[PDB]
Structures are given as structure tokens and as C-alpha cells.
Amino acid sequence: LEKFNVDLMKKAGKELGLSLSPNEIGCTIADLIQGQYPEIDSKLQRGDIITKFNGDALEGLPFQVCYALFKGANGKVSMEVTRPK
Amino acid sequence: LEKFNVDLMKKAGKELGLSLSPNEIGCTIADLIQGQYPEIDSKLQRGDIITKFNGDALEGLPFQVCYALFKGANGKVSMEVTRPK
Amino acid sequence: LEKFNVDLMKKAGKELGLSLSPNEIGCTIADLIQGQYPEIDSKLQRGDIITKFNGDALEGLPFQVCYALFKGANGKVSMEVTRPK
Amino acid sequence: LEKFNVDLMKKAGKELGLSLSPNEIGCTIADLIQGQYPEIDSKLQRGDIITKFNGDALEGLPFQVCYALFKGANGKVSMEVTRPK
């Protein structure tokens, strides 16, 4: 159960390229567009679960949060992630 | 200030047509499409703040929840609203 | 000097695919990703200038607005556009 | 409530590291990266509201301006800030 962090500087013109879906403990990465950020391409994989983003714990929040997690994202982007089996 | 509730039944393929933005106590209705739902044309206006959606209080949630508040919402939509003066 | 409107229902999972840059009277479409929305693919072209979005006139605003015009976009998306020569 | 100003000189390739969200009177600093700029480490905290940036008052501007407020900002960055209690 590897738990790690993903930290990057978001650029206004580059979307993170991540598609999420609700999960019991956060937001699962259901899909990922390769080539957006090196920090993502070097660490993240489908199935990994984002448990917190910029200080907010994502477990237990309305499921809609996952579908808009990165909307309005700017500057600092800090994620705590967990990878299932 | 006025506080009221809005309840409507979503029809498949008929979006609510509301565009929201973050507010201290919820999600402000920044823009709207006239003619989508009678319940909306009858009780909602730009500037109104949705404070609770389908049982979930919106104050305190990450601001981005306002960007996909209606995703996955089928059946009866229940909103609690506050209207400034 | 054709002036027209672009109206669509944004889907949480589909970005508009538009890249803007500052313009004297609004935000110019410097780049466009084909295949996102039919309303865009059937009307918009590079060089067209967005002069207003969801009730806000874009002329005279800080240039940064154009670089974040669609961040947080949800539900109703209504644009007024002008096409140069 | 406290009101103060923050002035710093951006260095090429060194992002400010601030992440903002919409606020009634400006752009709230939702998160931040410690160690980017001494001026930031010395006077800014989460919850502070940037009310004016490089001469532009932020209250009244489309809420999305908070999502790319620092793009194109090179040289001296000047901010007016309000801090709740």
C-alpha cells in the first residue's frame, strides 16, 4: 500500500490531464493523459487514489467533489496519493 | 434576505442550465438558462446562493464542489437557497 | 464583421479545448482543439474574438482574465463572438 | 481585520507558489508553497485576501480572474491584502 505525494506548479495553459471517479477514501484516477506534467508522468498510474488535495481530505465528501477536483486549480498543486493492489 | 427551497425532478437529457461560482456560504448562481425547468424559471435568479444540495450542506466544502454540483443528479433535485437583498 | 453567439451545456469531463490570448476588445481564440463540442466545431475558428462570456463584457478587463476565462466553467456556457478579417 | 501590502520582485523560473480561490472582495490564498519568496513567507497566510494586484482592483472582476492572476507578471509584484481575524 504505497502512499506518496505529487507536487507541481500548475500552468494556466496546461490541464493536469486526469479523470477521476468517486472512491471510498477519495478520488480514484480512472484515466490519465500522458505528457502534461513530469511530476505526474513519473509517479501516477490509473487506480491510484488521491486522498487529499491542497489541504483538503477527500474521504467522505460529496461524490461530486471528485468530478471537479481540479477545476480552478492554479499555482500550487499538492496531492497525497495511495496505490491499491 | 430571503431563504426558500426549490425541488424539481430532472428529466433525462435536460440539463438544469445553471452556472455556479463559489460563495462564502455555498454556490452562487452566476448565470442561468431560461426555459429549462419551470421550478427554476419560477424561483431562481442570478445572485441566489445554493446552501444545501440533496442533503449536503455546501458551506465548508472545497470551493470546487460548485463546479460539478449537479453531476450524477437524477430524480428529484432538492435545494436550499438564500437570496440577498 | 460577423458577430454571433455560441451556447452550449458544459460537461464536467469535457474541456472546451480553447486557448485564448488578450485582445483589445476581448479574448482571441488563438488555438482550438477539434472534437470537444459540436457548437464549437460548427461555429468557431482561430482569430475569432470572444467579447462576452456569461454576462461579463470582456473588453477592458485585466489581461489575465483571458487566460482563465473558462476555469471553473460549468453548466451554462454562453459566448458573444466577433470575427475579424 | 488587518490590511497590509506585499511587494516582491519575481525571478524568472521561480513561481510564487500561491493557489487562489474566489472571494467576495478579491482572491483568497487557499494554499501556498513555503520557501518560494521571503516576502511571502514573511507576510502571507492561508485565508488572506488579495484585493488588488498590480494596480487592478479585484472586487467586481469575473471570479475566474483568481485562477491566472499571476500570468505574465514579471518584475515587481504589488499586492494589497486583507486579513480576517
From Swiss-Prot, chains A, B, C, D:
Phosphoserine sites (modified residues): 19, 21
Subcellular location: Cell projection, Rhabdomere
Post-translational modification: Phosphorylated by inaC.
Location of the PDZ domain: 5-85
Domain of life: Eukaryota
Tissues and organs where the protein is expressed, per its UniProt entry: Expressed in photoreceptor cells (R cells) of the compound eyes and ocelli.
Record remark on domains: Second PDZ domain is a type I PDZ domain that tethers type I PDZ ligand inaC by interaction with its C-terminus.
SUBUNIT field: Interacts with the C-terminus of trp, and with norpA and inaC to form the inaD signaling complex. Interacts with Fkbp59, which together with trpl, rhodopsin and calmodulin may also be part of the inaD complex.
Role noted for this protein: Involved in the negative feedback regulation of the light-activated signaling cascade in photoreceptors through a calcium-mediated process. Interacts with tetrapeptide ligand located in C-terminal sequence of 3 key components of the visual cascade, tethering them and forming a macromolecular signaling phototransduction complex.
Name of the protein in its database record: Inactivation-no-after-potential D protein
Name of the gene this protein is made from: inaD
